Design a protein around this ligand. Structure first.
Ligand code: CU1
Length: 124
């Protein structure tokens, strides 16, 4: 089984996939985010955030209110299962999480800085 995924966020405010599959056998899962292109993080920075689909809008609302100073996430938001740092072009970050925190239950990933950038994460 594959228990990681490589995802890209580019200068055109897009991830290169809208769906991630987590094998049901994985006990941990790693997301390796990178940023092809050339725009720095103060122009077009990206992160990767995981929550349930049901919680996404709530996380984004409270993130927006928290602002740039907090990378557009409410600090310690219990709805956020995992997240990366904000990265600019040429930079990378990885986050690993325990699959036991996933159930049910439909999950989504998104960029907190640019919440139009989204996709689904599913156990398979
Ligand atoms: Cu982004």
């Amino acid at each position: 089984a594959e228990c990681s995924v490589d995802i890209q966020g580019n200068d055109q405010m897009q991830f290169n996939t809208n769906a991630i599959t987590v094998d049901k056998s994985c006990k941990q899962f790693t997301v390796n985010l990178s940023h092809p292109g050339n725009l720095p993080k103060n122009v077009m920075g990206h992160n990767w955030v995981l929550s349930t689909a049901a919680d996404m809008q709530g996380v984004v609302t409270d993130g927006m209110a928290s602002g740039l100073d907090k990378d557009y996430l409410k600090p310690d938001d219990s709805r956020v299962i995992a997240h990366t740092k904000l990265i600019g072009s040429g930079e990378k970050d990885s986050v690993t999480f325990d699959v036991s925190k996933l159930k049910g239950e439909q999950y989504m990933f998104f960029c907190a800085a640019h919440a139009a950038m989204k996709g689904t994460l599913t156990l398979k």
